[PDB]
Design a protein around this ligand. Structure first.
Ligand SMILES: *[B]([O])([O])C1=[C]N(C2=[C][C]=[C]C(Cl)=[C]2)N=[C]1
Ligand SMILES: OB(O)c1cnn(-c2cccc(Cl)c2)c1
Length: 358
């Protein structure tokens, strides 16, 4: 644990915890490929349980990066094609607005205005079919980006259909297991509940509730160790022995669309490195991140660029996560907290850390 890393991590994170009133936090820095871990505070305030390297946190939409890689793996397996019509995997989706909407559009939030959330009222699967059949696009496919659970969540559910596996089984067998992510879960087993931190929202202990497409869009929980290993795998996909998974990772980092200075991957989002920090910091604010923006198609997509800042923010009601890494520098960071605090503070802290080490 080189002093440089200790100092820049503590110097940045300590004031962040104080300003944001974060109950508990874990951080991993991957430096020259090796991880270094840091923890603070409480996984469970009431029971006085500290955050440790084994504490599980809700990753919220960092889960989209696993969905994107799992889709990538299914493409590499020849099970699906991003050019396939959505209706190929969901024949019951007969309404005319779906003509021309492909798995690519679903995966990348470009279908034409699918909403951020699946409505709470959608409880059953027939409820889900009804919702997509009745949905009216505001825009032609592949013209505008609108960040959306109903978009990538459906991509993840359709991507695994040819396998015949449930989404959770596919994720476990094809992604978590090969990568030795043995403490990463879509559903936290009872044996691991001791380690599951509470999230804190207005002072109240909370965990994410069940919802439609939850597993696919925001439902993964993980430890700081497994998340460092996730970053290592995404930094260096060529060390992964399972061919389709290596390829899936690279596909998730390809650049499909551009809006402003960001590129949309599958789950991952990327900018050219060196980045302008105001651009990623201000860009992470939900006033920008969640807004409808015109996109330019990248035809064909650019393969994973090593000189990139590759990142994803994640939140649930009680948790705030961030992952960012730079392949060409063998450098990355994971920040997991059990309070959903503002995105720009996450990115500001991550850039201050990675910049000092780069
Ligand atoms: B993502 O973190 O940007 C994201 C997560 N969610 C979410 C979290 C909990 C419940 C529900 Cl319904 C949605 N939306 C966006
Ligand atoms: O030659 B290109 O740069 C190229 C070839 N294939 N792709 C690509 C990228 C991402 C996803 C898919 Cl299905 C194909 C880019």
């Amino acid at each position: 644990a080189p002093q440089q890393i200790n100092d820049i991590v503590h110097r940045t994170i300590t004031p962040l915890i104080e300003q944001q009133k974060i109950p508990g936090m874990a951080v991993a820095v991957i430096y020259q490929g090796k991880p270094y871990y840091f923890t603070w505070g409480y996984a469970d305030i009431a029971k006085k349980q500290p955050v440790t390297q084994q504490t599980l946190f809700e990753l919220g939409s960092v889960s989209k990066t696993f969905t994107g890689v799992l889709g990538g793996d299914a493409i590499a397996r020849g099970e699906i094609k991003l050019s396939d019509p959505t209706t190929k995997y969901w024949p019951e989706l007969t309404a005319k607005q779906w003509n021309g909407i492909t798995l690519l559009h679903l995966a990348t939030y470009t279908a034409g205005g699918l909403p951020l959330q699946v409505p709470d009222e959608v409880k059953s699967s027939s409820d889900l079919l009804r919702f997509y059949q009745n949905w009216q696009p505001a825009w032609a496919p592949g013209t505008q980006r609108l960040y959306a659970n109903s978009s990538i969540g459906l991509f993840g559910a359709l991507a695994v259909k040819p396998s015949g596996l449930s989404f959770e089984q596919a994720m476990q067998t094809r992604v978590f297991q090969p990568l030795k992510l043995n403490h990463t879960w879509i559903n936290v087993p009872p044996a691991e509940e001791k380690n599951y931190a509470w999230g804190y929202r207005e002072g109240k202990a909370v965990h994410v509730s069940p919802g439609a497409l939850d597993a696919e869009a925001y439902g993964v929980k993980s430890t700081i160790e497994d998340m460092a290993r996730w970053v290592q795998s995404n930094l260096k996909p060529l060390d992964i022995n399972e061919k389709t998974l290596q390829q899936g990772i690279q596909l998730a980092q390809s650049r499909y669309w551009q809006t402003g200075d960001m590129y949309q991957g599958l789950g991952w989002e990327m900018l050219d490195w060196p980045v302008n920090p105001d651009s990623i910091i201000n860009g992470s604010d939900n006033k920008i991140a969640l807004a409808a923006r015109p996109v330019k198609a990248i035809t064909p997509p650019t393969p994973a660029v090593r000189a990139s800042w590759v990142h994803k923010t994640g939140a649930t009601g009680g948790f705030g996560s961030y992952v960012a890494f730079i392949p060409e520098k063998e450098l990355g960071i994971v920040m997991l907290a059990n309070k959903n605090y503002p995105n720009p503070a996450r990115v500001d802290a991550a850039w201050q850390i990675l910049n000092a080490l780069q």
